Sequence to fold (128 residues):
Amino acid sequence: CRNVLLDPQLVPGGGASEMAVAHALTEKSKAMTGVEQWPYRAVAQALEVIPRTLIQNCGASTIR
Amino acid sequence: VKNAIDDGCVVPGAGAVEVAMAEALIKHKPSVKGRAQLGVQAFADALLIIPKVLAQNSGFDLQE
Fold:
């Protein structure tokens, strides 16, 4: 209620949200180039470990 | 290909044959006695290794 009352804008996430940012950063690292791209690509991946674990409970090859 | 000349009949494989044969055993007693039945379960699940494990190598869960 404090969330909605502050910002009527909210994410339709569901672990979709961690994932959304993770892929977002990978796209940008490639475009920008520069000395920043390797540390920025490293953090992109860290975020992606988390929604992968949610699929681990469900079954099959998580990464596919 | 020597065998193909020997037999007249060649089946589709890839652990196709083996699930079919295992299914046939689980359902009824082949001799109708309980003495036979204790080895029969054992015989049927032994066969299932060949198909499931092609899935395992590849990275696809075996039960599915």
User: Anything to note?
Assistant: The interface with chain B takes residues 59-61, 64 of chain A (CB under 8 Å). Helices of chain A lie at 2-6, 16-32, 37-47, 49-58. The radius of gyration of chain A is 15 Å.
